[PDB]
Design a protein around this ligand. Structure first.
Ligand SMILES: Nc1nc2c(ncn2[C@@H]2O[C@H](COP(=O)(O)OP(=O)(O)O)[C@@H](O)[C@H]2O)c(=O)[nH]1
Length: 296
């Protein structure tokens, strides 16, 4: 039983990209201070927070607003999570809602016993350093709050998207990245207790994405993932690695083994590696290798 919660406008856009993209397994939850944004959210469940602080508007960008706003609506949050086994808290740090509220939403789910995984974006360093300063705090808030935290610095997406890609639209790929991050894990649900062993109380986790379509797609996707810009360090330091190989109908068993072997070689000699495949019909010909490394 899986529930992904979108905390903030950033998170809610990533949640709505997770919905627009066919994703059949999981419950979606939208959390914001802004009433407007919640209306545009595609999630089944929505939650407005700070209904007494904000009077039904947004948190207007200060992290102190969401923190207290979350506490105000702690009741409703605990209700929405009830009986989820694993919770994904997807949010953009730097904002008001996410920065303060999302860490509280997390520790709610951790205190409720669900496996809490945090998939959060850092803001672009091109977004002003004040917003970067707040995000740095919010990140450290979540590190305490979650079992595993996957922190994707948006700047590292500048090593992915075009220079032509507008700034206010570069978040659409950041959406897609959070999608692949959550979806990579969620799609594999392997033994749940195995995943627990990889995620439970591990802390800071790195993500690696690689996509390839060609002659050598298996090898080419795994190599790209092993050395994804999103990885702050190469994964050899990790004690636990989860790996996903998502492909079309044409996805070979051979290809899976090839990609698995490649990633295994890159990981520590005696790493706890667990990996699975996913046939996703909607995929044309590209396969996607998603690497989550834990424990640093
Ligand atoms: N993935 C994603 N990230 C975003 C989007 N818009 C903004 N962000 C990032 O998320 C951070 C917070 O934005 P926002 O969610 O509006 O703040 P909040 O509403 O106070 O939680 C910013 O620093 C942005 O870098 C979006 O549409 N998608």
């Amino acid at each position: 039983t899986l529930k992904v919660i979108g905390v903030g406008g950033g998170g809610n856009n990533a949640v709505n990209r997770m919905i627009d993209h066919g994703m059949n397994n999981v419950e979606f939850i939208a959390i914001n201070t802004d009433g407007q944004a919640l209306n545009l959210s595609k999630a089944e469940s929505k939650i407005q927070i700070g209904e007494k602080l904000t009077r039904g508007l947004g948190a207007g960008a200060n992290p102190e607003i969401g923190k207290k706003a979350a506490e105000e609506s702690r009741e409703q949050i605990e209700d929405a999570i009830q009986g989820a086994d694993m919770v994904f808290v997807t949010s953009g740090m730097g904002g008001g809602t996410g920065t303060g509220a999302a860490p509280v939403v997390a520790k709610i789910a951790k205190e409720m016993g669900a496996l809490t995984v945090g998939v959060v974006t850092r803001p672009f360093s091109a977004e002003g350093r004040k917003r970067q300063t707040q995000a740095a705090a919010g990140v450290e808030a979540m590190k305490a709050a979650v079992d595993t935290l996957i922190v994707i610095p948006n700047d590292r997406l500048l090593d992915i998207v075009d220079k032509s890609t507008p700034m206010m639209e570069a978040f659409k790929e950041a959406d897609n990245v959070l999608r692949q991050g959550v979806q990579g894990i969620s799609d594999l649900i392997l033994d749940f207790a195995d995943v627990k062993t990889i995620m439970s109380n591990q802390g800071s986790a790195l993500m690696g994405i690689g996509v390839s379509s060609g002659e050598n797609r298996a090898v080419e996707a795994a190599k790209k993932a092993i050395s994804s810009p999103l990885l702050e360090t190469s994964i050899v330091g990790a004690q636990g690695v989860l790996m996903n190989i998502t492909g079309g109908e044409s996805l070979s068993l051979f290809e899976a083994q090839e990609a698995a072997d490649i990633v295994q070689d890159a990981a520590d000699e005696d790493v706890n590696m667990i990996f699975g495949t996913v046939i996703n019909p909607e995929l044309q010909d590209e396969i996607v290798v998603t690497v989550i490394a834990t424990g640093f």
